[PDB]
Amino acid sequence: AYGYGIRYEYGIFNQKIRDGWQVEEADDWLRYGNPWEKSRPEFMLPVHFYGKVEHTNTGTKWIDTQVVLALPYDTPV
Amino acid sequence: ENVAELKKSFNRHLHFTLVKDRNVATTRDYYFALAHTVRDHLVGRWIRTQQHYYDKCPKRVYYLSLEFYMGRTLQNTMINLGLQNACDEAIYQLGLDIEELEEIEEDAGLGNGGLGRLAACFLDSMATLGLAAYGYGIRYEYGIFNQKIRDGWQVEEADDWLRYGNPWEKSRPEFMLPVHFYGKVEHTNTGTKWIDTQVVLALPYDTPVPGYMNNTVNTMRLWSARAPNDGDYIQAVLDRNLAENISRVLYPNDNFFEGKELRLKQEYFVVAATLQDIIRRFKASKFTVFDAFPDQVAIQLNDTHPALAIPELMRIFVDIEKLPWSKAWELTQKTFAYTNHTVLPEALERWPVDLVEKLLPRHLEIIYEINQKHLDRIVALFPKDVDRLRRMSLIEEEGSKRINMAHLCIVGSHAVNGVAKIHSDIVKTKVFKDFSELEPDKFQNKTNGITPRRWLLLCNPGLAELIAEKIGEDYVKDLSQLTKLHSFLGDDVFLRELAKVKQENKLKFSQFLETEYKVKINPSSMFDVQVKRIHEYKRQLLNCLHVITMYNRIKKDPKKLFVPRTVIIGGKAAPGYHMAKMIIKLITSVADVVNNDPMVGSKLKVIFLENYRVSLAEKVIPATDLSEQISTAGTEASGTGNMKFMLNGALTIGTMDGANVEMAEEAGEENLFIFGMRIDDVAALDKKGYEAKEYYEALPELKLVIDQIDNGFFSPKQPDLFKDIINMLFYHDRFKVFADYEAYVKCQDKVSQLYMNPKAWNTMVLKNIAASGKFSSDRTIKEYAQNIWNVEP
Amino acid sequence: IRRFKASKFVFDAFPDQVAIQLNDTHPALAIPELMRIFVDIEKLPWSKAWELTQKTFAYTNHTVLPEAL
Amino acid sequence: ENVAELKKSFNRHLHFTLVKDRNVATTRDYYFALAHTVRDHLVGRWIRTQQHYYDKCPKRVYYLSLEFYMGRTLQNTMINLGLQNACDEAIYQLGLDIEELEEIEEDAGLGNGGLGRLAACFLDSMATLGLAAYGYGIRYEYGIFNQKIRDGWQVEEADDWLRYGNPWEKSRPEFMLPVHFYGKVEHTNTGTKWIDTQVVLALPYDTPVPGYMNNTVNTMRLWSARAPNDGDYIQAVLDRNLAENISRVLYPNDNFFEGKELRLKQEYFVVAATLQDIIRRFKASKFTVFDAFPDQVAIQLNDTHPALAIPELMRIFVDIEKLPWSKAWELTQKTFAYTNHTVLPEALERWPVDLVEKLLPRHLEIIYEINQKHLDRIVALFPKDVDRLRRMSLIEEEGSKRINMAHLCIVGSHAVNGVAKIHSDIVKTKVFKDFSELEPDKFQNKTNGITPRRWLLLCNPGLAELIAEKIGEDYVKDLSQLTKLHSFLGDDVFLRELAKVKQENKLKFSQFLETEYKVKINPSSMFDVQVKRIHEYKRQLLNCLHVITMYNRIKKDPKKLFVPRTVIIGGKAAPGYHMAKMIIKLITSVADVVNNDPMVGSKLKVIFLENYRVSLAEKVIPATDLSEQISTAGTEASGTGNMKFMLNGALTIGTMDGANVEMAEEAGEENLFIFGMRIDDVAALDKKGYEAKEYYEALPELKLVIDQIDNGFFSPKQPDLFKDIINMLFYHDRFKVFADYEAYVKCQDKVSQLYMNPKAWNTMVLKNIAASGKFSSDRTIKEYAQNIWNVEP
């Protein structure tokens, strides 16, 4: 088995009670470092967003896209 | 188009076209049903394409050649039409294996090697670029012979490729034409008349040439010889074979001139038919009327083989269309362009005027007049220099008069090109100096190329997919896009994936080798490959020396670390080429000793790849680690196999000759294993004098090899079997094998070193593949379109 | 997909080597994305790819609350 | 320590730290495993060193700078720890190439050029001398951008140097600190209070600085910006980027002031954190308590960038530690020392008081008070001279009020120094005349230096070994020992060995050039190099004129003996520096015409060295024959690249400017190719009036070059592409390029003459290297230690 998700810099917020109301504080869980994760840079990948669809004889092409990279981090289970 | 409908069409053809059902259908039957199913997808665009050319009348390009080394058509057609994946699925769903059906198809081997394969790659490129191009050749009943090895020797078998029928060809009876021979000339008051001739009919067969994913389908028109219809009755009917013998068989000579009357008939046959077909088409279009001819028609001469086209066109314009000489000649020079494909003396076409007088009387007269107008000019511009007249004449006088067809092509053409920088240079400043000095702008270079469809997409889908997943499919039509590959030089994973692709190709090709040959293949060894026509200039002999060399080093120190190799050498030898046949026997003799010696084991295997042809090149090329391109510097006009291996992930070891020089420039010299003498070194060694007995005396490793070959170590039953080889090496070797021996071996040692460093080896592989873009035949044709034919996509 | 190709692999065996559980609808786009890869990248016909897809994916519904759909 | 144990440690890290084995390990993985293996050797001495400083409390030196151009750390660390040879052997025994692993390491390019590299050389020197020194900067997520050339133009790419992680840095979370911004001031009865501020946290990262073979390891502490922890929730979390943008990227400007609010934030950010960290440390040691502060702490201001430190310290002493102004001010002046690094008007920092009022309200008030006490004094000593008050004020009134940070540094410091005799002189008697007249003993000179470890031992091992075999290894710590080299001026063999070293460096660097660029390199040609940030004052343009000059002479008389050269010009241009970018395009345009003209051939090659950085300087510098140091006299404060080339065997051609003047003094003027106007000539030409159209009218060779550049000879597709360059040269050239053209070219001709006399050339080379001792940064720091910081090794 393999789990697949997103490595959020900020997880679910830390909740505090101020004057009886809930107050949210950023959960900066990686500030001091996480020894349990292992970057795997050789497996980085590009992800596309936006752009448009071109219908050519070589089939449909998704062009003019903005690219973002995906850097995986493995945690042992 | 979709899977379900492809299954129905297949079953429909198996039934109505093959008259079979699943219980009685043969493998050939399934293949024909699939072939017809795919073939139907071309018809619409083929009619549409040809109709478009008629309505818009773009300038037409005619590639005239005696050779078209087409290989197989089914897979190629499925890829260019975007049907492969669908057909693969449909066939699989019908319970069949498409790969097995594909092996049924006979190769259309109407060529000898490069020259014929270049023409085939050009058609693909011209169709992919959307040009109104037409290829014109001869529909040989028999192509290049099928090669077999019996008792270590090459044995030839007729290549009866049409026996079972050809679904990819379409007879065009309405365009049949008569071609004349012999007869005599009559200079009357109504024009010159070529009469009392022997007539042979030419029946054209059209084969569709589909471009890659563009809806364009051009035509390859091949002519067939047929007896006219107008002593013993039986013999007379049988004698009809004589005429039909004209398009019977392809002359099996690569880079060698054989002045056989039948060949001269094939040259004129294809030429007379083609030029009459182009003229008819011209006059049938929207068009003194001929002034626009050179603006509507461009004819490329593939080597001097179709040289007769120059006078044939003149004959037509003057005797048929009644145009004055001066005008006829002008249009001719604007119409023709000549490609010189070789510099080897033995390959030069020099026809005895006696032979030409008897067979083509009217053409001899025209060639003589062309030479007169030609020499009158020279005499004017150089009143003194009479030796220049002799060197530029279309006629050679020394002994029996002969015609220099190359000279004839130069004067009747407006463009002349070599097939690689170093070759074109040698052609312009050395071989045809006297001509280029007068007409400098006439000579050019058009470096050869190979189509990335058949030679990448078709032969190595794994590599095409890997590349495509990283930089898109853009590269198929614009190969210079492979340079983006440099972005991943430090990407360890992409390098492991690149290697996996090669290894899979090697594992598969290995299954082919253990199936066709006894030998056990070390799948981890290095695949050292040299496949091309057997020639002394290509030096399969040099390679053979290195193999025996490696063998001895192994026997000498069995415990000495040796990088394993599987040396593969293949190629057909011209039937009458004695030295080529002997070289084949030597290789087969070596393999026998090598592959069966317990001490060498899996360290070294040698294979003489039988029946090397296009379909076989598609299998071994993707599986190669090391490509041997070792002809003597200045002897290989260009080479194309070298490009094939470069595009498919192999490293190259060769001399600075042909296109090898340009490969080094594109990828960087350090990323190739260059060695040996260069154009200048060979010349120096010549002026001085090549004494082969010196290297033998100064190199012990070479001496051991030579002694083994000379004393019978590789032919115990026949101690002097290789005498002729030894004799040529020591006294008649124009290709200086012994002179590059030392550099070659040292180069080979470095290759072995690098092979042991996968990271380094594949890194270089990636730079080569990244630098192969330049060699796509689309780029070659692009330069032809712009600088010679003046046509646009 | 890269792992599948690097193992002892064309894609006919994909569903027999790969099972992808979609935790609620959040990763729903994985379905059309695989179709995209199969068809636009791997050049497989639609019918074949749709078949490989359904065999590969499994969906787990984690709620019926209208505001969570 | 020994080979076997280094192999085990390497394998131990590959396994436990990289979670890899040999079959799946990447090149980056091996590099990290080696890096960690070497890194372990520093820990013991790093803890020991810092513990020693705490127990003995020696005076501490803090080098405060916005820049640290560190380059790579692995090799440097192996050399200073005496591990290189052992690691090289271990790695080789593991089947790897240490050189390939080293190339994986990203440069820590947190600098723009000299100013940042000087700081880096200083840390090395301070650690080698055993000083209790600390460097303080900003840990930029992105350093100086990575440069690429696309279509002849410089293109910028983010230098994401931390992406894969940095083994040489150590987060120190327990020392995190808050830095405030904005807010307002409150003058209460319990002290002044700076409130309602925006807080940003600064997280320090420590990097060890190992001295050469001495067991000392100091620290380089770089600060990182982090958002505090105490509308739409998502946006709020995302908005945390704003604060963190403070230490996001290094401003890519060399010698140019950009008054951007973000930059002002970086200046204060690094300053507030540093001063609070030093104060805390001070109060945490063995210590009214602050009276001993200046005896325990010395802070050097690298240029005016960290000028805010003066008021920040005042703010701390008065508002936090509750010290009276008079005392606070005294301690401050005893603590700070200021180094002026430039005299170029455009590089001067002048912040609009409006910007400072909003961002640093409490600091504006303190700067105003400092100016009041400052001007009250002047008014006293010069009751009449009111214009003197305007010229010495910390505030400039002309138009929008601005703050002269340099003035602020002078009054708050007890020492001010230039970076070279001629520069310091100009700083003391001209630019700051009004200040030095009152406080003469305040101004000094501290000629720049470069570390012989990285810039000799690391970059040119062959030369270090040759030198070491002749005079011992003593010179590494005392470079003035190179003078013993004079003992071998007539030693023909030592001269042939000196030349071999250079040639090897040239052959290796040549492989780098043919690998990165198409061009074919003449390994025997003269390596003419000018690598530095692109500037009009540095005159890469002048060099370019000479190249075009040489090119024309070659075209003019192809058969005229020409001493072959490989001209290399490289350097990054500030992104918004238009003229610098245009200059790059010109050079690339020239190379294209030059490198591809058949008539010039191997006589001349031109290369625009892409992405010039520390690791690249280490490759090209050892490979240089001729070093171009040709900035206009009086414009280069000092220069350090010039020193690098001198120590590595290159001859210099330049003007009497910066440290070039001192190089001539040490080696003897005749042993350098000096030319052009001098500080006095340029002034005369100014008073008179520089009319560039005169030299163009009086020098045909220059006119030809100019016409070619202006008429499109180097940009056919864009005839007026270089219009802006021509326009500046003829009407807006403050660096008088045309004025030194003639002298420069004549100087260049003499260099060519000498190059043809190997004995003479290398003899001069030896005198230069022998005279380079003075330029070791150990000597520079020694003078800083004795005359400004008052600390001992």
Ligand SMILES: O=C(N[C@@H](Cc1ccccc1)C(=O)N1CC(C(=O)O)C1)c1cc2cc(Cl)ccc2[nH]1
């Ligand atoms: O960063 C080092 N160790 C690591 C150890 C670590 C790793 C993973 C989680 C927690 C701690 C470290 O302290 N951190 C990584 C975290 C971050 O990125 O902020 C904090 C380190 C050890 C070392 C030893 C020498 Cl000699 C020089 C530099 C060094 N850095």
Ligand SMILES: O=C(N[C@@H](Cc1ccccc1)C(=O)N1CC(C(=O)O)C1)c1cc2cc(Cl)ccc2[nH]1
């Ligand atoms: O020739 C027929 N189909 C063709 C189908 C075909 C066409 C072109 C190439 C290969 C196969 C056929 O079998 N061949 C042509 C080849 C040749 O030239 O010898 C072999 C055919 C189908 C059919 C069906 C009926 Cl009911 C009667 C006669 C028929 N002939």
Ligand SMILES: O=C(N[C@@H](Cc1ccccc1)C(=O)N1CC(C(=O)O)C1)c1cc2cc(Cl)ccc2[nH]1
């Ligand atoms: O992060 C580990 N090693 C570290 C090792 C390292 C440390 C510092 C610089 C480079 C490499 C790692 O791979 N990186 C830190 C870099 C980053 O900040 O992204 C990349 C690690 C080892 C390990 C071993 C197990 Cl069993 C589980 C989790 C693990 N993480």
Ligand SMILES: *Cc1c(COP(=O)(O)O)cnc(C)c1O
């Ligand atoms: C490509 C090819 C050739 C040309 O090979 P060279 O090595 O260039 O002589 C010859 N024969 C076949 C079958 C080919 O596919």
Ligand SMILES: *Cc1c(COP(=O)(O)O)cnc(C)c1O
């Ligand atoms: C040394 C160095 C410099 C300083 O060069 P000058 O010629 O003194 O301006 C600039 N950049 C780099 C990368 C250096 O190594």
Ligand SMILES: CC(=O)N[C@@H]1O[C@H](CO)[C@@H](O)[C@H](O)[C@H]1O
């Ligand atoms: C006469 C002849 O077959 N020439 C061949 O032509 C091909 C195609 O141009 C070249 O690649 C090759 O080197 C050359 O030997």
Ligand SMILES: CC(=O)N[C@@H]1O[C@H](CO)[C@@H](O)[C@H](O)[C@H]1O
């Ligand atoms: C502002 C700035 O970057 N100044 C630079 O400082 C270095 C180090 O002192 C000098 O060598 C150089 O000539 C000068 O241009």
Ligand SMILES: Cn1c(=O)c2c(ncn2C)n(C)c1=O
């Ligand atoms: C290439 N070649 C041939 O193909 C050949 C030949 N002699 C006969 N043939 C067929 N010779 C000498 C030759 O060099």
Ligand SMILES: Cn1c(=O)c2c(ncn2C)n(C)c1=O
């Ligand atoms: C088949 N074959 C040849 O083709 C051959 C030969 N000797 C020379 N040649 C060319 N021998 C002995 C032979 O058996």
Ligand SMILES: Cn1c(=O)c2c(ncn2C)n(C)c1=O
């Ligand atoms: C050095 N330099 C720059 O770095 C610069 C500039 N203009 C913008 N920039 C970034 N100018 C005029 C300049 O001289």
Ligand SMILES: Cn1c(=O)c2c(ncn2C)n(C)c1=O
């Ligand atoms: C990339 N680039 C520039 O950077 C540039 C320019 N013209 C001026 N500059 C600065 N052009 C035309 C250009 O392509």
